[PDB]
Design an enzyme around this catalytic site. Structure first.
Site, PDB file in Angstrom:
ATOM      1  N   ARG F  91       0.813  -1.210   0.000  1.00 14.87           N
ATOM      2  CA  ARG F  91       0.000   0.000   0.000  1.00 14.87           C
ATOM      3  C   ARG F  91       0.851   1.268   0.000  1.00 14.87           C
ATOM      4  O   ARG F  91       0.629   2.182  -0.795  1.00 14.87           O
ATOM      5  CB  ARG F  91      -0.913  -0.011   1.222  1.00 14.87           C
ATOM      6  CG  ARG F  91      -2.129   0.884   1.126  1.00 14.87           C
ATOM      7  CD  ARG F  91      -3.134   0.335   0.138  1.00 14.87           C
ATOM      8  NE  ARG F  91      -2.828   0.768  -1.216  1.00 14.87           N
ATOM      9  CZ  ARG F  91      -3.407   0.276  -2.305  1.00 14.87           C
ATOM     10  NH1 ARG F  91      -4.324  -0.678  -2.198  1.00 14.87           N
ATOM     11  NH2 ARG F  91      -3.067   0.744  -3.501  1.00 14.87           N
ATOM     12  N   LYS F 126       1.665  25.885  -4.061  1.00 17.59           N
ATOM     13  CA  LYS F 126       0.382  25.243  -3.779  1.00 17.59           C
ATOM     14  C   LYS F 126       0.590  23.745  -3.869  1.00 17.59           C
ATOM     15  O   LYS F 126       0.459  23.139  -4.939  1.00 17.59           O
ATOM     16  CB  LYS F 126      -0.696  25.660  -4.784  1.00 17.59           C
ATOM     17  CG  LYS F 126      -1.208  27.064  -4.588  1.00 17.59           C
ATOM     18  CD  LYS F 126      -2.206  27.434  -5.659  1.00 17.59           C
ATOM     19  CE  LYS F 126      -2.539  28.921  -5.593  1.00 17.59           C
ATOM     20  NZ  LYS F 126      -3.406  29.393  -6.728  1.00 17.59           N
ATOM     21  N   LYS F 158       3.847  40.977  -3.370  1.00 23.58           N
ATOM     22  CA  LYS F 158       2.616  41.246  -4.107  1.00 23.58           C
ATOM     23  C   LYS F 158       1.911  42.429  -3.450  1.00 23.58           C
ATOM     24  O   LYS F 158       2.498  43.105  -2.607  1.00 23.58           O
ATOM     25  CB  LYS F 158       1.716  40.010  -4.119  1.00 23.58           C
ATOM     26  CG  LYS F 158       1.287  39.535  -2.751  1.00 23.58           C
ATOM     27  CD  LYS F 158       0.578  38.188  -2.832  1.00 23.58           C
ATOM     28  CE  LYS F 158       1.508  37.076  -3.301  1.00 23.58           C
ATOM     29  NZ  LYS F 158       0.804  35.760  -3.385  1.00 23.58           N
ATOM     30  N   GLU F 188       4.830  40.379  -7.999  1.00 24.52           N
ATOM     31  CA  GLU F 188       3.634  40.022  -8.747  1.00 24.52           C
ATOM     32  C   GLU F 188       2.895  41.298  -9.129  1.00 24.52           C
ATOM     33  O   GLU F 188       2.652  42.161  -8.285  1.00 24.52           O
ATOM     34  CB  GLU F 188       2.746  39.099  -7.911  1.00 24.52           C
ATOM     35  CG  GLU F 188       3.340  37.708  -7.750  1.00 24.52           C
ATOM     36  CD  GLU F 188       2.533  36.814  -6.830  1.00 24.52           C
ATOM     37  OE1 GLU F 188       1.319  36.650  -7.071  1.00 24.52           O
ATOM     38  OE2 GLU F 188       3.118  36.269  -5.870  1.00 24.52           O
ATOM     39  N   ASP F 209       0.361  38.601 -13.509  1.00 24.71           N
ATOM     40  CA  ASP F 209      -0.760  37.869 -12.943  1.00 24.71           C
ATOM     41  C   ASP F 209      -2.042  37.907 -13.772  1.00 24.71           C
ATOM     42  O   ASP F 209      -2.621  38.971 -14.000  1.00 24.71           O
ATOM     43  CB  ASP F 209      -1.035  38.380 -11.533  1.00 24.71           C
ATOM     44  CG  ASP F 209      -1.599  37.308 -10.634  1.00 24.71           C
ATOM     45  OD1 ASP F 209      -1.799  37.588  -9.430  1.00 24.71           O
ATOM     46  OD2 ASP F 209      -1.835  36.184 -11.133  1.00 24.71           O
TER      47      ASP F 209
HETATM   48  O1  LIG Z   1       1.499  30.401  -4.078  1.00 21.08           O
HETATM   49  C1  LIG Z   1       1.946  31.429  -4.664  1.00 21.08           C
HETATM   50  O2  LIG Z   1       1.653  32.589  -4.214  1.00 21.08           O
HETATM   51  C2  LIG Z   1       2.817  31.221  -5.855  1.00 21.08           C
HETATM   52  C3  LIG Z   1       2.172  31.191  -7.126  1.00 21.08           C
HETATM   53  C4  LIG Z   1       2.859  31.006  -8.291  1.00 21.08           C
HETATM   54  C5  LIG Z   1       4.234  30.838  -8.293  1.00 21.08           C
HETATM   55  C6  LIG Z   1       4.919  30.861  -7.074  1.00 21.08           C
HETATM   56  C7  LIG Z   1       4.229  31.055  -5.815  1.00 21.08           C
HETATM   57  C8  LIG Z   1       5.114  31.056  -4.572  1.00 21.08           C
HETATM   58  O3  LIG Z   1       4.779  31.774  -3.534  1.00 21.08           O
HETATM   59  O4  LIG Z   1       6.161  30.363  -4.565  1.00 21.08           O
HETATM   60  O1  LIG Z   2      -6.953  -2.425   2.750  1.00 18.21           O
HETATM   61  C1  LIG Z   2      -7.993  -1.641   2.833  1.00 18.21           C
HETATM   62  O2  LIG Z   2      -8.249  -1.022   3.896  1.00 18.21           O
HETATM   63  C2  LIG Z   2      -8.915  -1.469   1.631  1.00 18.21           C
HETATM   64  C3  LIG Z   2     -10.306  -1.209   1.942  1.00 18.21           C
HETATM   65  C4  LIG Z   2     -11.265  -1.031   0.939  1.00 18.21           C
HETATM   66  C5  LIG Z   2     -10.867  -1.106  -0.386  1.00 18.21           C
HETATM   67  C6  LIG Z   2      -9.566  -1.349  -0.721  1.00 18.21           C
HETATM   68  C7  LIG Z   2      -8.547  -1.537   0.259  1.00 18.21           C
HETATM   69  C8  LIG Z   2      -7.169  -1.792  -0.246  1.00 18.21           C
HETATM   70  O3  LIG Z   2      -6.410  -0.793  -0.410  1.00 18.21           O
HETATM   71  O4  LIG Z   2      -6.730  -2.966  -0.499  1.00 18.21           O
END
Ligand SMILES: O=C(O)c1ccccc1C(=O)O
Ligand SMILES: O=C(O)c1ccccc1C(=O)O
Ligand SMILES: O=C(O)c1ccccc1C(=O)O
Ligand SMILES: O=C(O)c1ccccc1C(=O)O
Ligand SMILES: O=C(O)c1ccccc1C(=O)O
Ligand SMILES: O=C(O)c1ccccc1C(=O)O
Lengths: 273, 273, 273, 273, 273, 273
Positions: F91, F126, F158, F188, F209
């Site tokens: 898993r 992100k 920004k 930005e 932007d």
């Molecule tokens: O999440 C953001 O504001 C972000 C968005 C685009 C590029 C870079 C960034 C960053 O902060 O590194």
């Molecule tokens: O193992 C589990 O908990 C499981 C539970 C429900 C579906 C699939 C799995 C799986 O990943 O094999």
């Protein structure tokens, strides 16, 4: 703090992925609970209990103190906080108190049989994994004293180490500079001769290991005559029925590992009253 | 590994700032040591011992297995490695095996007294802090079975919980979708009436908490007539002198926490050559 | 191992999110490198260097030993492993050696000026955050001795603590039971009177703090006459130009925190040669 | 917090198994202590000190700020809390402030000698193990600037790297897509020719490693005529007696690692009442 | 708490060496921000967000609650704290809420298309690394139900496990004394002939792996003929266009890992104002 | 190593108290398994998988490599180890590979539709909690480029940051002596009038932007009039149907967080055989 991590891990171990009850519980609410005794004994674990409660946002309205005696049906602590959190903490809080008071209580028994203020009852390095400090603290609350807390605390040489030391007096004299300035060296002995050579070799402490009261007494006297500043400790399978006799031999202390490794849980429980 | 950290913690507590002998041992060398018994008992802790030895760089030449019986003077393990490491690991290794074996041996005496192949013996959630998994593993090696390992393993409602659940049946019915699909629910009952209404409520397991053998048979019988897939468990200060009687009650399991909390160290020691 | 975590964190701190070079490096390959000296001095940090190399899969073909002297252009270690990993380790490996050898070297200077085999040079608890054990180890490789390693190691009472002790002899006599059996108590003194009262109070060690050689000498003699087993330590702003004079006063040891807090890096570098 | 763990580690190392005094202090109480100077210098470590005091439960009544100058006898901090905690935290607090301030003060002397508002002073990646961020923060408080904090901060190629890069320009060109979008690349050069070809290669920053002031001016001039957006940095055992000369070279920054690795503790002490 | 470590680690990954803005900001001030939505969905992650702000200083003024629906532009949270801490937490706050809400919302669409109250929606052990507890908690907020949380929660046997034994009957009958007393045994099957064997084996649950509705019903009905208590679950692949079809097949649950391993973020964003 | 902790934690979450199967299995044996694909995509996570098997004992026999394409049925890995460890790791192995490949593959489709070599695809900050390093590494394997990895990597300003100063010029000119010497400052912008100010401010990069291609080009061209070195990036929302359009706008990079915050698993699975 010194034991906040101890309690986190104690706790973590019990709720694993997460307490199932807190999922199903309809509505949460502040409730009060009491830890009650179901046996007699010496209460130990106060320091760990307050940190656990604090740690989990549980108030501690009342508690007895670490060395206090108690009878069954006695309220030991009054705690207040979330119902869900009292339940998640319950067993951890109780295993703590029961185990720790078990050691203080068994220890109190020995202190009792010992009956002496000049002689000290010591524990050993025979503790349960991860509880060295926890159990050592317990022994104190029982009314006795602690031996070193570890291998960094002091040097203790026994047959195993000695079998490879050609000249003991030479070894000790020259070891002092490779050991911290404050360390004491203790030599375990199994005869009067050994003890005599140890004191002359430079030991700060001699352990009369597995020796009759007579033997010990001879060694104790010799130390008094020469080497009055060397400390003497009697050790071996000293029993409750045997301690008082040893306290009269002249040794400064008596150590019995059983204080910790032969202790068991005392019966307590939590009433949501 | 799973128990890798556990073993690190046990060791750290012991050498703290660092082992002192190591500072004065003039010349280190490989040597062999034996872990010998001083009491009869059931061996436990092999899994931990071996991991300790490996991470410690000590070799394990020979060792008996996790469930073998043994008698005084018997050589339990043969290890080899640096002299300095053998000494630094000695107490941790022994404390580990003596504590684990103590529980296994104690459990061993209950498995016998119980004398059954249909009724399994269980432990409790009463375990020393940080040693849950360790102590549960130990119980397995005595010939018994384990109960749940935590508050996440299954849902067990007792007095405290029940005082706030007015309609069980309904509670249990709607609790299912908020528990993981596989969870079982258990309910502690202290009277035939309580058990009967728990079974009817939809309980997977019912605990007969502090009830005469007769009282228990009554519930056992009722469970067989109706509710044949509900597991019954008996518990309540069940001593070594009463388990057998309870085994005949008709229950599926008997839980006694003392297997862990009343167990003590089995005498053992490490010897060179 | 005792210092594997130390090195992980040392390292972790340098490559943060991840070494940028290992991203851009076209092809990796096994390369050999040497740690060369650019100054003279005493080599310290061997124990930490081998663990770091081990830890990162770098072989250690050759290395000088922890207390060996060296001249500039001397090869100190020959290591071999992945090019990318030699670079990721370089600064950590060098900061280790440079810092640690800096302390051993400054320490060696004092040992030199001291010129005595009967008197010991001690360090202090004045160390840099998180390097207590690392620096204490360094001082040893310089040829001196360590003072206690911490506050759990031994009891040291000074003006701050004493100002609140009504009866010192009483305090010490009754403190022994609440301290581990092996602990020594040391009292810091600022006069001959204080030292005299300390020995009579029960101290195991007296620190002649900020006292002329004459003062110290008087105290040293008194100890020899009465209390021959009490240890004497001279301390204060002892300089290289001042140590030899103190070594002749009769004290057992001289401590100068400057050994660690006034030490600086020695110049070394890594040649991919 | 970011530096929370750092502070925990520093403390643990000091009390190990637990502070001993705490065991014998008969009655604990609130008290006030002052951190006084014994030398002139620049104060640093406030951020750490305050976090240490808070997690320790000690109050900070007053404290000077991270860049203030001070002279002997000056009261630097006024704190209040349990007597026992004041003593347990004392050495950690002081060692922290004395080490941090030592670096700030030493850096302070370079900032002056440099005497410029256009040329910034930088540190290096030569820092004591585990104290990188700590020592870099310290440098900031001396009035200087920081270089990159690690191997992830930016890409700096030197001799070792360059010996395996046959065509820089090309290497630098194709390296961009494998580095994070924001990374800068720096190349150490030991001759006008090397710098010139680095600039042409596409370097963001060029280091003039061990070059006369004349040699450096030559590169500075060339950079102004062509490649005006390339940052030049000079470094190479640049002493307190030569930085100023180098400041006039025309470089953007001068890096000297000794600001950290040649710094020593500023004398300080804690006093009650 | 239980997920405070999770948050520290999350926040630790983003800032690393230290946020750069705070080294630039002149004066910090307390400001307010709003976590505003930019899309429609079901909110999740209130538990982690509140813990993150608390342990981080930021004050939580207002917040919708887990499981509440929201539309674009809607203000989901109003926080108050230092300008620096808000900027330092922003990214970490949104990623939690967005990833969490993303799973809740997608889960709510399967819940919706399932349209049943006698059948529950389950998730799987198919979760992103280090995020199981987080993602399992996110599914509940979508209105569905969680499956076991790990391999310690229950025993789930399939072909690979059973490839080899002859018995299921005795295998299972004996796996019971080796599993914690409260643990259930589920068996994954691919044909009527298999599910049929599992029930006769003693299974507690049976999974109908990617079978047909006609295939399922055969088992559903058969489950009713005998073995009314053994639960049935049967999704193998299932989809929005086929859930309902199964809900009317006679099974107690329908698991679909896609609720988690197919969820994507929900658009959100923090604005000062 | 650098991500060994990441793996321990991942594996830790799945087994918790301990895998149940291993308590049931009779005899363990070494077996082989194949990580086989069930969908088409770009493989990623070879680095973590190999580390997981090594630290876990399982032996890696064969494996395709990061960035290699694959189709359904294809065998991506062949592993060899104990039957129990393979089941316990299964898993955890798949979740890594599937989540990682899922991001690589989706990233490769944006790379593909971007169709350019003078413009690079970037990711964002992100990322899912605790997975940044993992997911950033996954994007590279898709064939794109990573942006900064955290707030310590670079300074990105920004509106919210600049809401308040009057100068950008002096603000930036002075933020330089407070940022590590090698750090870049990106700003930005949302309008030509803004990007125009940033370049005159002294920015090292400018983000356009969510602007229009005609809006972008104005800046792209302007960037060429003067400020040829300042980089330009301009995605705000971008999509597969609009990437190319921007690639021909004059910017150096196009960032799109969706490469990560919109990726879903790839179907894979482990079969013994
Ligand atoms: O999440 C953001 O504001 C972000 C968005 C685009 C590029 C870079 C960034 C960053 O902060 O590194
Ligand atoms: O193992 C589990 O908990 C499981 C539970 C429900 C579906 C699939 C799995 C799986 O990943 O094999
Ligand atoms: O455990 C022991 O061997 C021991 C026994 C008696 C006293 C002290 C010790 C000790 O090592 O601290
Ligand atoms: O400790 C208990 O209350 C307990 C007692 C008996 C069986 C099981 C448990 C349990 O919670 O697991
Ligand atoms: O740091 C000190 O005050 C000190 C000074 C001299 C010797 C020992 C110590 C010590 O505390 O260990
Ligand atoms: O230590 C170095 O090689 C070094 C020297 C001067 C400036 C910067 C660095 C650095 O790597 O950050």
């Amino acid at each position: 703090m010194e034991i906040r991590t101890f309690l986190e891990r104690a706790l973590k171990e019990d709720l694993g992925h997460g307490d199932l009850f807190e999922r199903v519980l309809e509505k949460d609410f502040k409730a009060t609970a009491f830890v009650r005794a179901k046996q007699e004994g010496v209460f130990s674990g106060e320091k760990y209990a307050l940190e656990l409660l604090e740690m989990t946002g549980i108030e501690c309205v009342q508690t007895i103190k670490d060395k206090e005696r108690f009878k069954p049906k006695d309220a030991l602590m009054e705690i207040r906080g979330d119902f869900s959190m009292l339940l998640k903490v319950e067993r951890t809080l109780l295993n703590l108190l029961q185990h720790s008071s078990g050691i203080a209580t068994l220890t109190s028994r020995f202190v009792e049989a010992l009956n002496s203020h000049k002689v000290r009852l010591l524990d050993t390095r025979k503790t349960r994994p991860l509880l060295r400090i926890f159990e050592k603290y317990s022994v104190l609350n029982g009314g006795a004293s602690n031996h070193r807390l570890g291998l960094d605390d002091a040097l203790m040489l026994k047959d195993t180490h000695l079998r490879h030391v050609k000249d003991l007096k030479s070894f000790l004299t020259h070891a002092r500079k490779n050991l911290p300035f404050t360390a004491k060296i203790e030599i375990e002995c199994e005869s009067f001769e050994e003890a005599k050579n140890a004191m002359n070799a430079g030991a700060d402490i001699v352990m009369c290991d597995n020796l009759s009261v007579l033997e010990t007494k001879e060694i104790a006297a010799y130390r008094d005559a020469h080497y009055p500043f060397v400390l003497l400790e009697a050790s071996g399978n000293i029993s409750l029925e045997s301690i008082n006799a040893y306290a009269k031999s002249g040794v400064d202390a008596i150590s019995v590992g059983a204080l910790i490794h032969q202790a068991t849980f005392i019966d307590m429980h939590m009433k949501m009253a």
